[PDB]
Amino acid sequence: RSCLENSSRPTSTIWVSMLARGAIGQRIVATLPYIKQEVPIIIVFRALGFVSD
Amino acid sequence: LPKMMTLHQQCIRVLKNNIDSIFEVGGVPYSVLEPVLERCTPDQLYRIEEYNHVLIEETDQLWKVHCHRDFKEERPEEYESWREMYLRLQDAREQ
Amino acid sequence: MDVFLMIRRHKTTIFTDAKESSTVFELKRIVEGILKRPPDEQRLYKDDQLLDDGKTLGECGFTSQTARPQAPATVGLAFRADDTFEAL
Amino acid sequence: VGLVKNLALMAYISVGSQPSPILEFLEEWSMENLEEISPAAIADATKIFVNGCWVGIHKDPEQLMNTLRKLRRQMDIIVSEVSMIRDIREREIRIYTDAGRICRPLLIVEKQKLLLKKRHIDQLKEREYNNYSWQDLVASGVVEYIDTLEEETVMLAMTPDDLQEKEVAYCSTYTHCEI
Amino acid sequence: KDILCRLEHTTLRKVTANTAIYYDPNPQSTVVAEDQEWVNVYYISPWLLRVELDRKHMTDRKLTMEQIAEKINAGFGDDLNCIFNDDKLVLRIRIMNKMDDDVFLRCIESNMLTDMTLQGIEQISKVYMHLPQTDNKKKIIITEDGEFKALQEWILETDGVSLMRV
Amino acid sequence: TVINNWLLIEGHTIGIGDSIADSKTYQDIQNTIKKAKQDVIEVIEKAHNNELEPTPGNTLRQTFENQVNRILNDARDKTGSSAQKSLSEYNNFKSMVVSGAKGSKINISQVIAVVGQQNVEGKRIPFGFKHRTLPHFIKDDYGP
Amino acid sequence: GFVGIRFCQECNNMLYPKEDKENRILLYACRNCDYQQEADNSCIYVNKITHEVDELTQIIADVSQDPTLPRTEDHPCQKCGHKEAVFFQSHSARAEDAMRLYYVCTAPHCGHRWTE
Amino acid sequence: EGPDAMYVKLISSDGHEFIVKREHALTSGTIKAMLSGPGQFAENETNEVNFREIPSHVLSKVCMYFTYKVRYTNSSTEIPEFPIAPEIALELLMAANFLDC
Numbered sequence: 001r002s003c004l005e006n007s008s009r010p011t012s013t014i015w016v017s018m019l020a021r022g023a024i025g026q027r028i029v030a031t032l033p034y035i036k037q038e039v040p041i042i043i044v045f046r047a048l049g050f051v052s053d
Numbered sequence: 054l055p056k057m058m059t060l061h062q063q064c065i066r067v068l069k070n071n072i073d074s075i076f077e078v079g080g081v082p083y084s085v086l087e088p089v090l091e092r093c094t095p096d097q098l099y100r101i102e103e104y105n106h107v108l109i110e111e112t113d114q115l116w117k118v119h120c121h122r123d124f125k126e127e128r129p130e131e132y133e134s135w136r137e138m139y140l141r142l143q144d145a146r147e148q
Numbered sequence: 149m150d151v152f153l154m155i156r157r158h159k160t161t162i163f164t165d166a167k168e169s170s171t172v173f174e175l176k177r178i179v180e181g182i183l184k185r186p187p188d189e190q191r192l193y194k195d196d197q198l199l200d201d202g203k204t205l206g207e208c209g210f211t212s213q214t215a216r217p218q219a220p221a222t223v224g225l226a227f228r229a230d231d232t233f234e235a236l
Numbered sequence: 237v238g239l240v241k242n243l244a245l246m247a248y249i250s251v252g253s254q255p256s257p258i259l260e261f262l263e264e265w266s267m268e269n270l271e272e273i274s275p276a277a278i279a280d281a282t283k284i285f286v287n288g289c290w291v292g293i294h295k296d297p298e299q300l301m302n303t304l305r306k307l308r309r310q311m312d313i314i315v316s317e318v319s320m321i322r323d324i325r326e327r328e329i330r331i332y333t334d335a336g337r338i339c340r341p342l343l344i345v346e347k348q349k350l351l352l353k354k355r356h357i358d359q360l361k362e363r364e365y366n367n368y369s370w371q372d373l374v375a376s377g378v379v380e381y382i383d384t385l386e387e388e389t390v391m392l393a394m395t396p397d398d399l400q401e402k403e404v405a406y407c408s409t410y411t412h413c414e415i
Numbered sequence: 416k417d418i419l420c421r422l423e424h425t426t427l428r429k430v431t432a433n434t435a436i437y438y439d440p441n442p443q444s445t446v447v448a449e450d451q452e453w454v455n456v457y458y459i460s461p462w463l464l465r466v467e468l469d470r471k472h473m474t475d476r477k478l479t480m481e482q483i484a485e486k487i488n489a490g491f492g493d494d495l496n497c498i499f500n501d502d503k504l505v506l507r508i509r510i511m512n513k514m515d516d517d518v519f520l521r522c523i524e525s526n527m528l529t530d531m532t533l534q535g536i537e538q539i540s541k542v543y544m545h546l547p548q549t550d551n552k553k554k555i556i557i558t559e560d561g562e563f564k565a566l567q568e569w570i571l572e573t574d575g576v577s578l579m580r581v
Numbered sequence: 582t583v584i585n586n587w588l589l590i591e592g593h594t595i596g597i598g599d600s601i602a603d604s605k606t607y608q609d610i611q612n613t614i615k616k617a618k619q620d621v622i623e624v625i626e627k628a629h630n631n632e633l634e635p636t637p638g639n640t641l642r643q644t645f646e647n648q649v650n651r652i653l654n655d656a657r658d659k660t661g662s663s664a665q666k667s668l669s670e671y672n673n674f675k676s677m678v679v680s681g682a683k684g685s686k687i688n689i690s691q692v693i694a695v696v697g698q699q700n701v702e703g704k705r706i707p708f709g710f711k712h713r714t715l716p717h718f719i720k721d722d723y724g725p
Numbered sequence: 726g727f728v729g730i731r732f733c734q735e736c737n738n739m740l741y742p743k744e745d746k747e748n749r750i751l752l753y754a755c756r757n758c759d760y761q762q763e764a765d766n767s768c769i770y771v772n773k774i775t776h777e778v779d780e781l782t783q784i785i786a787d788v789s790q791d792p793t794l795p796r797t798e799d800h801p802c803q804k805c806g807h808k809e810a811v812f813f814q815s816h817s818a819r820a821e822d823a824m825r826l827y828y829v830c831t832a833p834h835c836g837h838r839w840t841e
Numbered sequence: 842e843g844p845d846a847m848y849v850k851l852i853s854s855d856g857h858e859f860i861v862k863r864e865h866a867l868t869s870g871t872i873k874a875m876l877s878g879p880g881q882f883a884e885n886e887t888n889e890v891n892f893r894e895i896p897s898h899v900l901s902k903v904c905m906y907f908t909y910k911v912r913y914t915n916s917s918t919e920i921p922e923f924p925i926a927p928e929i930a931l932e933l934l935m936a937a938n939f940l941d942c
């Protein structure tokens with residue numbers, strides 16, 4: 001529940017979750033604020049500016 | 054304490070509980086005093102060495118056990134015994 | 149069990165070992181055996197409680213505590229029964 | 237039941253502070269920033285969190301926590317209500333300055349001895365003569381405020397009888413004592 | 416205990432120590448090289464699934480490796496060949512005859528670990544044997560003399576319900 | 582009406598003297614508590630040195646918990662039995678218990694001898710800190 | 726044994742296992758760029774289902790500085806002979822089946838960790 | 842002091858010398874090397890053990906410890922400790938030099 005210090009603003013909550021076993025493997029996804037669907041975490045890292053694995 | 058102790062062990066365990074009681078060692082060699090000084094902290098070593106100066110050149114290797122515990126990233130330079138290095142870095146860090 | 153008394157004559161102290169009941173002049177006998185002390189020279193004083201004219205060790209002054217190997221109980225000695233009582 | 241709670245008598249809820257003095261002190265007390273480090277140095281170093289912000293890593297976390305506790309105990313750069321937690325197993329140092337942290341004052345214990353001596357008690361017996369107060373006792377490095385996250389790393393003696401204990405004291409590394 | 420083993424569900428996961436995936440295009444020269452002798456006794460995709468089973472789980476379930484092998488063969492109908500030996504309990508699985516065979520063997524290994532039954536009934540996870548010391552769950556009988564006699568007999572409990580199969 | 586008017590003559594009270602046991606009873610209770618704590622420490626040493634055999638149908642931690650709770654329940658039961666055995670015929674806790682009016686032998690046991698094990702959700706007090714029930718204990722302290 | 730991630734060099738991405746039937750061997754190929762590399766270890770993937778018997782390698786020596794950990798002087802260090810050592814149970818989710826004690830030497834510059 | 846050796850006298854340059862059971866001074870390291878010197882059999886029975894520079898109370902504690910340790914080693918008891926005063930331990934530690942124990 002991320003909230004910027006030195007300011008009075010609402011807290012933005014990010015959920016870095018992992019899918020259950022029941023699926024070839026279990027994957028890590030990210031539920032971002034103001035985003036309707038879950039996003040895979042590697043896509044978020046690439047959109048942050050790091051394309052290489 | 055379900056332990057048997059000889060005279061060496063009895064004296065050094067009592068003294069290992071009350072290091073702080075030592076003001077002046079008299080004339081004990083360090084080789085006898087080696088256990089109680091290794092379970093000790095550097096301020097007490099400074100107190101002991103500044104009341105019992107004759108021990109100083111004996112205790113320098115002991116200071117290494119303190120130095121690699123308080124200044125683990127460091128090494129002595131040449132013409133630096135461990136006591137004077139520990140005091141120089143200790144006062145430099147406090148300053 | 150044990151006994152622990154520093155037989156203390158100023159500058160000469162005798163060591164003993166015995167049990168909780170023994171006649172008190174057998175202490176003088178075991179001093180006599182090695183230190184060549186006649187019973188005149190073996191006027192043992194009191195304890196903190198008065199000494200044992202009944203002549204056993206399980207009588208006044210001696211408890212189960214005074215047989216302490218941790219630290220014994222000490223009292224002065226005079227090696228003359230009636231004439232003089234010499235300290236130092 | 238259970239949902240509505242009440243404060244304990246010496247519980248104090250922290251009011252908040254700016255992280256800037258602690259951040260500056262960490263910047264020039266040998267902590268390297270996240271921007272200036274290769275990731276290969278993160279594996280063996282201690283991550284440093286200030287109000288939950290990962291700001292850098294430190295190579296010598298024990299002397300860093302000793303220095304931070306010394307600063308807070310004499311009411312230097314770090315103010316008294318700042319919580320500093322060393323997760324030793326997880327190699328993390330978390331510094332919290334924000335509001336809402338509930339804490340309580342505890343007597344500081346160094347080497348099985350209270351730092352509260354008879355001189356402090358004698359000075360406090362004449363509170364309205366010496367002008368010695370509780371805040372002077374905090375500034376003396378005798379008591380300090382520990383919150384719930386820091387209390388999970390302290391070693392509390394219930395009484396000073398736990399300190400003055402013989403060969404098996406059940407613990408020889410008490411850090412604090414209940415008042 | 417025999418009935419308890421016949422009732423409790425046993426997947427391959429309960430008895431497997433490890434499963435490893437190898438590139439072994441020549442079974443004549445096994446790359447693992449600890450299985451050279453019995454594979455050469457027996458002797459195909461170049462992909463190998465090596466399954467090592469724990470000793471203790473294969474003993475207390477009273478399972479022998481031939482039963483697991485015929486369970487493989489019944490489960491897949493010779494879509495894939497599984498050889499085995501032990502004297503380390505070693506199975507070696509290949510897939511005889513665009514979704515490369517490594518991910519297909521991935522998938523069938525997931526099927527091994529999850530969706531295969533060695534012995535027991537699927538819905539029953541655990542079976543607790545006990546001998547009851549109270550008359551609530553005993554076998555009361557009427558003797559030849561005519562008294563009600565309580566017989567202490569071993570009874571089982573389950574953690575799932577598959578009543579008709581039981 | 583008749584019993585309430587005879588009770589004016591007889592009277593019934595409860596006092597602090599009904600909570601006292603004999604000195605011999607207090608010694609027996611302390612001895613039972615000491616022996617049970619020693620037994621719990623011995624089971625802890627057996628589990629720590631990997632000498633504790635799990636029972637069928639349970640894992641090692643739950644067999645340890647069952648053994649420890651068995652020892653402590655035996656302690657509470659024996660101390661309570663000594664507590665009721667100390668009680669005189671004039672004891673008013675005993676009077677209200679054997680009359681069935683109020684209280685039980687567990688209440689007498691808790692007042693006089695041992696309160697007993699505190700349980701949350703059927704287990705012992707959980708490690709709400711990192712492996713500690715309270716910050717006054719050492720980590721991984723499974724003692725009573 | 727375990728298998729790790731082998732990385733490409735052209736784009737530093739992940740290499741995926743693949744075979745060549747002309748050489749009939751195993752190679753780790755990058756499928757972002759066109760890089761290929763002959764694979765050293767034949768093991769592509771391994772389960773460790775019952776290979777959690779070890780917990781000593783995850784323990785760090787810094788827990789010798791933990792004041793809330795129990796200390797003993799009846800278990801001397803084997804590597805350096807120091808009399809004092811902290812002991813603790815395993816903190817894993819694999820520790821539900823074991824109350825096994827692990828010991829860490831409290832002497833600085835040693836950090837030796839052992840079991841019973 | 843008498844040549845029949847179950848009492849041995851020992852002096853520390855102080856007035857207060859001490860005479861102790863040889864059998865309860867048996868745990869000395871140096872009783873095997875300066876009463877059991879270059880030759881036994883009436884070297885021991887002299888019982889002039891003229892040590893130097895030890896205050897009286899110190900070696901009183903040391904030889905009381907001698908009796909203590911002799912009767913508390915190999916006996917039915919093994920637990921108990923020795924309650925020395927903290928300061929005198931220093932000079933008692935020099936006694937730790939002499940007696941090889």
Ligand SMILES: [Zn+2]
Pocket residue numbers: 733734735736737738755756757758759760
């Ligand atoms: Zn590439």
Ligand SMILES: [Zn+2]
Pocket residue numbers: 802803804805806807830831832835836837
């Ligand atoms: Zn070590």
